[PDB]
Amino acid sequence: MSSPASWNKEDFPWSGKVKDVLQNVFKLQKFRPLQLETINVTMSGKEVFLVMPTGGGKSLCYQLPALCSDGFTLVICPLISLMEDQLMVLKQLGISATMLNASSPKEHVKWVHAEMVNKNSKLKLIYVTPEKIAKSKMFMSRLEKAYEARRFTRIAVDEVHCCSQWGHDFRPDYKALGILKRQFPNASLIGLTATATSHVLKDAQKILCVEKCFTFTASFNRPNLYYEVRQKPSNTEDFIEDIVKLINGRYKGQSGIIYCFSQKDSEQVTISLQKLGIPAGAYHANMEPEDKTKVHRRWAANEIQVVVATVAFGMGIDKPDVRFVIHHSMSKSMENYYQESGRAGRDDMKADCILYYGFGDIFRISSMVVMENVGQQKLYEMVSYCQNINKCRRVLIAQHFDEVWSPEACNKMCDNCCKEISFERKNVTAYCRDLIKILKQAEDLNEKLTPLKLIDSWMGKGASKLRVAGLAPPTLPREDLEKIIAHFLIQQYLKEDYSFTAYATISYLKVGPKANLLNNEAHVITMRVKK
Numbered sequence: 001m002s003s004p005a006s007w008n009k010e011d012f013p014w015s016g017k018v019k020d021v022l023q024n025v026f027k028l029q030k031f032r033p034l035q036l037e038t039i040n041v042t043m044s045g046k047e048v049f050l051v052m053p054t055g056g057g058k059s060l061c062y063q064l065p066a067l068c069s070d071g072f073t074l075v076i077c078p079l080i081s082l083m084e085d086q087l088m089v090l091k092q093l094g095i096s097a098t099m100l101n102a103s104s105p106k107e108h109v110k111w112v113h114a115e116m117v118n119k120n121s122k123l124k125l126i127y128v129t130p131e132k133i134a135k136s137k138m139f140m141s142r143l144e145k146a147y148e149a150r151r152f153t154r155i156a157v158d159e160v161h162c163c164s165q166w167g168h169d170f171r172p173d174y175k176a177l178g179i180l181k182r183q184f185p186n187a188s189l190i191g192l193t194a195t196a197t198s199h200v201l202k203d204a205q206k207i208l209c210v211e212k213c214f215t216f217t218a219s220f221n222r223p224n225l226y227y228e229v230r231q232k233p234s235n236t237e238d239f240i241e242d243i244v245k246l247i248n249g250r251y252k253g254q255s256g257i258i259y260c261f262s263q264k265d266s267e268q269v270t271i272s273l274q275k276l277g278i279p280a281g282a283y284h285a286n287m288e289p290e291d292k293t294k295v296h297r298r299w300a301a302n303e304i305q306v307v308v309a310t311v312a313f314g315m316g317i318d319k320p321d322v323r324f325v326i327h328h329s330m331s332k333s334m335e336n337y338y339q340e341s342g343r344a345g346r347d348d349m350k351a352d353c354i355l356y357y358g359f360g361d362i363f364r365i366s367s368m369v370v371m372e373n374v375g376q377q378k379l380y381e382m383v384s385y386c387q388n389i390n391k392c393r394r395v396l397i398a399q400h401f402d403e404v405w406s407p408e409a410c411n412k413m414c415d416n417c418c419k420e421i422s423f424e425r426k427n428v429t430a431y432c433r434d435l436i437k438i439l440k441q442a443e444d445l446n447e448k449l450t451p452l453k454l455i456d457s458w459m460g461k462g463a464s465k466l467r468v469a470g471l472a473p474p475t476l477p478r479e480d481l482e483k484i485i486a487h488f489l490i491q492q493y494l495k496e497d498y499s500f501t502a503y504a505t506i507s508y509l510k511v512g513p514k515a516n517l518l519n520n521e522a523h524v525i526t527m528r529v530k531k
């Protein structure tokens with residue numbers, strides 16, 4: 001990645017206008033890190049790639065230059081919901097911008113087509129789907145003339161990782177985008193993404209034919225964020241009571257976000273918060289634009305304290321003063337978790353990131369990500385993070401962001417650095433052999449054991465048929481039995497198997513690949529616990 005220090009200056013020719021447009025049109029007082037550098041590179045007509053976390057402020061880096069340049073900037077965007085999110089903001093600021101998608105009405109397409117070639121048009125930003133480049137003969141016809149008229153002057157590729165089929169949410173239509181820079185070279189190109197992997201970034205640059213490219217990356221470390229993991233109560237009505245007690249005891253009246261696994265969870269959580277006296281409001285990526293705005297302003301007016309989020313792709317939410325982010329369930333991955341929790345403490349004042357870990361969420365999420373070849377591997381990394389008690393949470397998160405994360409000290413800004421505990425290891429070897437005897441007897445009976453069934457059989461309950469004759473129940477509190485089973489799962493003395501029913505995927509436990517090690521009595525399985 002390039003060094004941006006040589007660009008962090010306000011003595012370029014356009015600096016006076018950029019400063020003007022920032023304060024008087026966008027109503028912002030200061031640039032966030034790498035905003036001015038990226039803007040300066042684009043304004044000199046050079047290619048730049050900006051790696052910046054979600055909610056960092058990447059949009060400004062192509063919106064502002066559009067307003068300080070002639071003609072319009074073409075913004076390639078993967079979803080209509082993202083385009084609408086942008087046009088909502090641009091409308092309130094007084095900026096003329098529009099969008100084009102496959103469904104857009106005849107009257108609107110003819111208007112945009114005319115404005116593109118109209119030398120006197122106010123249109124500064126045209127958002128399109130990659131289908132408008134790949135599969136629309138006429139739009140490319142209007143771009144070629146707009147380039148002829150010196151009006152098509154910049155290209156912005158939002159979520160530029162999508163150009164690589166290695167990067168998440170890849171669109172095949174993004175591979176066609178290389179024609180823009182190749183054939184319309186005087187249009188400068190800026191690529192925005194939150195994903196740091198150098199392989200997806202260098203592949204994207206080849207695809208876009210922009211290999212002569214400045215790459216700027218932000219510090220992904222957010223030192224003002226406090227990371228914490230809490231145990232999730234089995235009873236969901238019990239659970240939201242604890243959430244309300246936590247919000248009232250720590251963040252009374254402060255705005256916050258709650259992330260939920262599902263949309264049904266999202267709205268159920270919303271109404272249970274409203275009944276218990278927390279003004280809440282649900283937000284979803286595919287909501288209609290006029291709904292999204294009301295959630296935002298009601299949030300801004302503090303008519304709703306908490307916004308209940310839905311975590312999957314296309315999130316709107318960002319507010320600068322979010323004091324807490326609660327994850328109702330763990331994320332699908334560490335990379336997802338960092339980004340989602342990262343919406344806290346924009347204002348650079350202290351904010352908390354609360355992750356609620358539940359034994360049952362291991363199998364609920366695992367079953368949902370069956371069709372992602374690495375889904376289970378990424379989820380187990382999240383579980384291991386939840387299970388960790390002896391390491392700084394910031395160290396664990398940083399290991400997923402090698403290139404983009406500073407060694408900078410945590411300074412007691414995570415629960416593991418603040419809690420004054422010591423640890424000891426305990427033997428769990430005989431527990432594992434008990435579980436394997438139960439799982440092989442179930443295998444002899446042609447029976448598949450869910451986690452619930454296995455614990456029951458282990459404790460001496462459930463179907464007598466699945467109980468092993470001589471097994472003495474472990475007589476530990478059920479939460480410790482759950483911690484034991486999850487440890488064996490992550491360590492692969494047990495593994496997950498799946499059943500597909502008419503409406504759901506159901507996870508089952510089976511003997512794991514490392515259980516052979518217990519045939520040698522020398523092998524000892526241990527767990528780290530709190531002393």
Ligand SMILES: Nc1ncnc2c1ncn2[C@@H]1O[C@H](COP(=O)(O)OP(=O)(O)O)[C@@H](O)[C@H]1O
Nearest residue numbers: 028030031032053054055056057058059060318
């Ligand atoms: N220099 C700045 N000062 C204050 N707020 C900013 C600045 N730049 C961006 N923002 C705000 O940050 C929020 C998220 O910006 P956005 O461009 O959506 O981030 P990204 O696209 O990187 O996810 C927006 O509400 C925007 O107004």
Ligand SMILES: [Mg+2]
Nearest residue numbers: 055058059158
């Ligand atoms: Mg964005």
Ligand SMILES: [Zn+2]
Nearest residue numbers: 392410414417
């Ligand atoms: Zn720490």
